């Protein structure tokens, strides 16, 4: 066995089409279901509809609602526990309401003979004029004593005579006819000694603190069902975590024995088609802000570095079927796009507007929208551009034009008759297929300094850079590759415009030297790149401030030191072994050592002489 899990429902009193339709989807949701992650809602079910699939239901996480049913029996015969992680209304984790119709018929049999715990929340019973036996149920065994005060029990039978509880039953309390429907008391029937549940009336049959409905024995693994989490039928306070502080390594480390959390369960791998959040919980799919990927046959959400990948149809396809260009109407549909599947056309019509297709002039400002675009699958076509804009500013993050589709079967990048001065395409590192044509841009400089053949993937691709401002003129006006650029060319005047630096680079920018020995963030170099020193190394006066990335490669620790790592503070209340939280103090040399195991709340010195009371 490995319990079947269904989603649950939260439609409350809403009715999904015909009674007929409603039941079909109820059945569809719960058929075979053992554990309900969400709520169980049984609603609008009529006379003579077989509801027997409900016999499979062992556990509900949310609430249980049973309302507006005329069906005779609701055989929730194995429901052991309602956690009440959500409430129906106010604060009821179980609500059984107006189960009757105008036709003088309603619900008779709700035999929940195995319902032993409601973990949180109260219960409402009202307007069930055909209900039997339940009114005899002694709720103090089922409901936590904090919720007794919000209990709403109104039992009134006016539609039948009922069967009677077996004399076998305790205090005449039962769920329906027969010995098998007697309440099984597991709380109110037990000696002082026991904290929680029980299975006998003696001192030596208390249930472990950890159990919910009752138990089959003393030990933590004999529970019927778990108050908090279960981990292969051992009830625990929490799922064993993914990271533990490593006393040897002096930091967080993969806890080998660690486990993800799924429902009220601790599990080594999420069920098929589930993703693990950055907190160790199995969820159905990743939050925006983050994305799906994989390390060790485990799908996880990592958080997006910059805008999340988003794919959009180009002009021509989809929302943009029959569109001549990006334009006032359509441009909004581009917000946040990262990759364009298809082509972009920016044409004069965009800026005049077009009374024929009912489109107003495009606010050129709005082209800022394209800044998120990193990939064009087809071709980029720019035949118009705001004249007071110096370069192709909206495409500063374009990394690749794949040129799968091409204008007239030819061009993958076409820039024609603009007022620009530089291309500005500083991120473009690949044009997969197609030809470049840059023509009639009378102020355009820089274009020739690029070796276009390096962006190309196919050896037949051609360039045509014609009738722009001449090499001669640009040179004569200083509009030429910055000093800090290698002989590999420009996309414009600025140092972040170069294809590659003659010396070193920060991020995208070219520089003459890194900040070794002087500077705001002190740095080291690798592959002509200036990488920052970890923020916990002290800026040194005389020599370098670090040799690499870690908190291990400081010359000198800015604050405290923990093994080989410099840290901002000593570890204080990090989760450790055996579920022993971990506390360190900083000595004279500002070096971290363990506190006395006994200092529940951290310490300032060694031993009990370090955490006064």
């Amino acid at each position, epitope marked *: 066995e490995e319990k079947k899990v269904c989603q649950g429902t939260s439609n409350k009193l809403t009715q999904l089409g015909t009674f007929e339709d409603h039941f079909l989807s109820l059945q569809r949701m719960f058929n075979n279901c053992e554990v309900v992650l969400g709520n169980l809602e049984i609603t609008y079910v009529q006379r003579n509809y077989d509801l027997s699939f409900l016999k499979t239901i062992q556990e509900v996480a949310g609430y249980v609602l049973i309302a507006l049913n005329t069906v005779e029996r609701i055989p929730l015969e194995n429901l052991q526990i309602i956690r009440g992680n959500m409430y129906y209304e106010n604060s009821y984790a179980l609500a059984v309401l107006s189960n009757y119709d105008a036709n003088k018929t309603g619900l008779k049999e709700l035999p929940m003979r195995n319902l032993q715990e409601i973990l949180h929340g109260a219960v409402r019973f009202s307007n069930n004029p055909a209900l039997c036996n339940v009114e005899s149920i002694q709720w103090r065994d089922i409901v936590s004593s904090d919720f007794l005060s919000n209990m709403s029990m109104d039992f009134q039978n006016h539609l039948g005579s009922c069967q009677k509880c077996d004399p076998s039953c305790p205090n005449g309390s039962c769920w329906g006819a027969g010995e098998e429907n007697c309440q099984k008391l597991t709380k109110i029937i037990c000696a002082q000694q026991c904290s929680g549940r029980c299975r006998g009336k003696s001192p030596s049959d208390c249930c472990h603190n950890q159990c919910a409905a009752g138990c089959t024995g003393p030990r933590e693994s004999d529970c019927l069902v778990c108050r908090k989490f279960r981990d292969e039928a051992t009830c625990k306070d929490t799922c064993p975590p993914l990271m533990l502080y490593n006393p040897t390594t002096y930091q967080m480390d993969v806890n080998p024995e660690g486990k993800y959390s799924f429902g009220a369960t601790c599990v080594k791998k999420c069920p098929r088609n589930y993703v693990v959040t950055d907190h160790g919980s199995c969820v159905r799919a990743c939050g925006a802000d983050s994305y799906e990927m994989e390390e060790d046959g485990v799908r996880k959400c990592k958080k997006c570095e910059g805008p999340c990948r988003k794919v959009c149809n180009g002009i021509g396809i989809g929302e943009f079927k029959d569109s001549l260009s990006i334009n006032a109407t359509n441009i909004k549909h581009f917000k946040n796009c990262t990759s364009i599947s298809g082509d972009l056309h920016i*044409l*004069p*019509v965009a800026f*005049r507007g077009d009374s024929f297709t009912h489109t107003p002039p495009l606010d050129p400002q709005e082209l800022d929208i394209l800044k998120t675009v990193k990939e064009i699958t087809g071709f980029l076509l720019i*035949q*118009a551009w705001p004249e007071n804009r110096t370069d192709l500013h909206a495409f500063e993050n374009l990394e690749i034009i794949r040129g799968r589709t091409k*204008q*007239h079967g*030819q*061009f993958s990048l*076409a820039v*024609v*008759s603009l007022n620009i001065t530089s291309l500005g395409l500083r991120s473009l590192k690949e044009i997969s297929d197609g030809d470049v*044509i840059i*023509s*009639g*841009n*009378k102020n355009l400089c820089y274009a020739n300094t690029i070796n276009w053949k390096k962006l190309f993937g196919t050896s037949g691709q051609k360039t*045509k850079i*014609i*009738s*722009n*401002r*001449g*090499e*001669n*003129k640009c040179k004569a006006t200083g509009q030429v590759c910055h000093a800090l650029c290698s002989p590999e060319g420009c996309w414009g005047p600025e140092p972040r415009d170069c294809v590659s630096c003659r010396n070193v680079s920060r991020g995208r920018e070219c520089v003459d030297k890194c900040k070794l020995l002087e500077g705001e963030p002190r740095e080291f170099v690798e592959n002509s790149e200036c990488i920052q020193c970890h923020p916990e190394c002290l800026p040194q006066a005389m020599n370098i401030t670090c040799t690499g990335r870690g908190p291990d490669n400081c010359i000198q620790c800015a604050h405290y030191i923990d093994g080989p790592h410099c840290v901002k503070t000593c570890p204080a209340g990090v989760m450790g072994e055996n579920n022993t939280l971990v506390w360190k103090y900083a000595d004279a040399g500002h070096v971290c050592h363990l506190c006395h195991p006994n200092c529940t709340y951290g310490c300032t010195g060694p031993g009990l002489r370090g955490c006064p009371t």
Partner: antibody
Amino acid sequence: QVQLKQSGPGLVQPSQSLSITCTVSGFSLTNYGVHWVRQSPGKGLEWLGVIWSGGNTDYNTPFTSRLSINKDNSKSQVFFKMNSLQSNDTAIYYCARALTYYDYEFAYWGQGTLVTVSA
Amino acid sequence: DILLTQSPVILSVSPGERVSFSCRASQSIGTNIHWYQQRTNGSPRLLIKYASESISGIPSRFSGSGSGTDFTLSINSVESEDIADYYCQQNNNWPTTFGAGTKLELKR
């Protein structure tokens, strides 16, 4: 068969305007710009401007302030207008279309209009 | 501004000889040069694009060569309908620009 054909009254009074129509066939103005080039004995062949396929124009510096080129794609017609002519402006005026999108290798030319600027 | 200087003003050749026309750009310009033929009363006619690239419809006895500042249109066995003006054009600097023309004349 790419063809360009010009019509337009060619004798023009000084300060009056010159208008020439260029009716085009065998390709659409949807896909190709039409250029305008003039020729005289004295100062040679000279490029005047373009209405590019998308409808935007571009004029050589000396005609910036007085050239006007328009088009009607559906009738495949281009309309050159130039204001305030003087005798500098006597020439044979031509429309042209490049062999190749966005280029200036002019494979096709109207028959030219002989324009004479006198009062 | 880019200057295009064609020379000679009149080229005088015997019919059948290999004749060559020269165009000199004042700034080095790759291969961004085209050539036209213009017959009396005719509109110009494209012969070579990008310095050396044949144009279809043009007889094979027309070739072109050059790169930078120095370009050359050539005719092997000059015919009598090769009597025309020949022009070069540049493609590199806004605006396109033409040379002044060489007149081809047949000796006799």
